[model samples]
Target: MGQQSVSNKLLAWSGVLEWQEKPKPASVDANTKLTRSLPCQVYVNHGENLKTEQWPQKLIMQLIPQQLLTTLGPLFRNSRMVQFHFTNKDLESLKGLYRIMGNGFAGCVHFPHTAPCEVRVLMLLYSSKKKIFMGLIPYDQSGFVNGIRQVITNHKQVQLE
Candidate 1:
């Protein structure tokens, strides 16, 4: 990559802006190493009051497609790293998870307060090639005592694989 330290912010090239701002004079580093192959972080917005352990990685991973897995790269494929946040505005704040994870990280949000048969899902996926992916899956809740699965599967009208 061409080393242009003073490029226009708007026209800044991919993966360059971060380096330009945080340069290490004596250190020779490639952006891809930090931006891509390392730090497989995942964030989630669980509905308010849910315990950390209550967040269900199993159910969520079951929904993640191979396309996302491929983008997530070898680090994510073989490792586990996750975090959860709970708030009341599930749907509106779902969009905000993107910024919190920053670039090169993934995120998921669940909105349980919908119609009887509907639960809303939001996701952010990142890859070693330095790509960002996001989407909403129209996918529930009992009380926390029964746990997240029941919360998502609570509705008699709902049946999820």
Candidate 2:
């Protein structure tokens, strides 16, 4: 029942992604004198297998650096899972670090289960273990997080090893 409907729907919606500007103070990097630069809000629709209709609950919204958009794939990949990434500095910027992370985690957990893919997600926060823990408590209290582990970059490991 779900397979054909999802396949047809994703093809119809693939090229329609939009990039909208954030307000002046939120986007501009003043230290660099780069007024021309702007960060944009990206709206991601859930993969085709989940639903074929326009629904509010099926969207993931985030703000990302504008330069990163130049290299995105021509089509969105199909999957039930989602990945959210933010840097250590991101916690500082959001101010409500726990609230923001919890919101995305909760949304992913609530999605309709598709055994082809588990109801799980990857959250990549480029923060040290200490900083990571300070923010992780909110997600834990909001709901359980599964199989957590820290993956450090090889470059840092090489220096230590």
Candidate 3:
């Protein structure tokens, strides 16, 4: 068989973005070589917390997808290697918003206070290729206590063949 393209694999794995909890340790082990916790990064909304103002939304529309591909795509295409990891909490928060549709679905949603949340991003660099994986976690807690650990363990066992 011909060699599989890393870009294709990365795109397929992008759905990991929707995982509301960290994947099971076994699944993680199957996919990546190593996992690590990194510093948290914040992306802020430059407006009042509860104010309703007509913000200029056109700035986002002005950014062409093609332009982004041209500018950033090459950097990912030529990489020799890449890897990442996320805590279960970080994965869970992302799953809440993206996959579960803002927590509308039962057993698949988490609604923390509406305040800004901090997210941890894993940046993998290989040769000239770069992959940035982001996961959001609760800022208040740590360790494998109540939340993500239970979910990942339960989910993994349930899905096992």
Candidate 4:
């Protein structure tokens, strides 16, 4: 698929992801211009049966630039990492860092799942490893439940993975 198509899908899926409103933190000086950039690390847990090399998947984590934040709306609310995890069959292979100009820059990696079909992803802040974020855009009822479950489980933690 094309870039617009991929971005559109991400935008649609973002609607289902949870958004949190927290203090901007004292460290982020008010003088600084806010930029959406993803320097965070991403972790994946996939099923054993899936062979990621043969069926490669593209995983992207980006920082939404300040200028494009308005376009992202609710999805961009105080979020550090905008993450996407999809199967290789659904996306082509890509590498290195790419800038989306008006949007933001992205660094992607190719990971092959060795066995199963399940996948889990984590997005984190580069400066603070403890600060992690996630997006859950469920496609089924079970998926919705899992999303809720994550919130409840991680709600009390100061940092999440």
TM-score of 2: 0.18
Judging by TM-score, tell me the better candidate of 2 and 3. 3
Query: Backbone collision count in every prediction?
Result: 1, 0, 5, 16
lDDT of 2 by residue, 7-49 (tens): 2132211111111223222344523421221111111235423
TM-score of each: 0.21, 0.18, 0.20, 0.20
lDDT of 1: 0.29
Report the error of model 4 at residue 25, Å: 27
Candidate 1 lDDT, 1-161, residue by residue in tens: 44232222111111100111112212334122332111122233333222323232322221222323333243233332233222224453433333334433333334333333234333434332433332322121222113323323433454469
For model 4, what is the C-alpha lDDT against the true structure?
Answer: 0.29
The residue-level lDDT of candidate 4 at 159 comes to 43
In angstroms, give how far residue 59 of model 1 lies from its true place: 18
Residue-level lDDT of model 4, residues 65-141, one tens digit each, is 23322332343233333344322221112111121311232121212366554454322222224322344322243
Can you write out model 3's per-residue Cα lDDT over 52-114, one digit (the tens) per residue? 133211110000112122223333343223222232456644343333222222111122234
Q: What lDDT score is found at residue 157 in candidate 3?
A: 43
lDDT of each: 0.29, 0.25, 0.26, 0.29
